[PDB]
DNA sequence: CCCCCCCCTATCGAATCCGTCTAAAGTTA
């Protein structure tokens, strides 16, 4: 997909969609990105994907990353709560707390 | 003429010596 605009036409398109159908139909939507990485300088960071404006899209935003050996869940945007941080866990019977 | 975005890589390079112990066996008028 060469054409940047198009792509950037065809997510606020979508998402547009996407909280329309939600509202209407009393619905929850869960959508899933992928990282990417963002040099300044000499240093790297971490940032999901999909340009700036797809920022605005979503109504709330959570980013998992690893720290050592452990999983942590960050609330980056919400308009109702506060940022925190949460340890969780992937265990045979699935998510789980610790 | 109009309005918005992308991405990690790759190993290197040796140094520095210390600290002594344990005696035994008589001979030939």
């Keep these: 997909l060469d054409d940047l605009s198009l792509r950037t036409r065809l997510l606020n398109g979508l998402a547009q969609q996407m909280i329309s159908l939600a509202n ?3 619905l929850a939507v869960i959508l899933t990105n992928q990282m990417t990485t963002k040099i300044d300088r ?3 960071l971490l940032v999901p994907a999909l340009g700036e404006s ?3 899209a979503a109504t709330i935003r ?3 990353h690893w720290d050592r ?3 942590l869940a ?3 945007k ?4 506060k940022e925190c941080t949460v340890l969780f866990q992937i265990k045979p ?3 789980r707390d610790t």
């Design 78 to 81: 919400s308009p109702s709560q």
């Design 42 to 44: 000499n240093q790297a």
């Design 24 to 26: 209407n139909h009393r």
């Design 62 to 64: 959570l980013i998992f």
């Design 54 to 56: 797809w920022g605005h």
């Design 69 to 71: 050996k452990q999983r």
């Design 93 to 95: 019977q699935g998510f």
């Design 74 to 76: 960050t609330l980056y």
